[PDB]
Design a protein around this nucleic acid. Sequence first.
DNA 1: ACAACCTCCTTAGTACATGCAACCATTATCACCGCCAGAGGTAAAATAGTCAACACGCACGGTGTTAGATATTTATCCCTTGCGGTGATAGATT
Length: 53
Amino acid sequence: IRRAATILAEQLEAFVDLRDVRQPEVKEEKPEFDPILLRPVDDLELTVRSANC
DNA sequence: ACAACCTCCTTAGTACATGCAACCATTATCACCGCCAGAGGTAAAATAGTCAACACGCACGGTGTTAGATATTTATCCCTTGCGGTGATAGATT
């Protein structure tokens, strides 16, 4: 039975021990000079399976 | 001379508002058939070309080997649980 009653048993920690959970936003909107960043992987001199994935 | 009035005459002007569902037929009717148009047909040559031949030449895909990645296994680590000790809350007062 326990998993079949868990959305009623594990609904109790819900009211105490009161630390919680969440995710962010992290990027910027792109792009300008100097062209040190304005380059594809072509500029790196690296292998082919890397260049596929 | 006219006026409107008595009576049933007929005429004909209208009939509230919002919305949804359904599919689009019936006619017969000589169009004759004669002429000839530019105008349908097609042979022979322009506007130009097919695809088979023998060459040409290349791409692609499958079989083979290699690569490395991934999902497993293992084991480690931390973040979490639940209870407990005792916390300065909640809020009444200063």
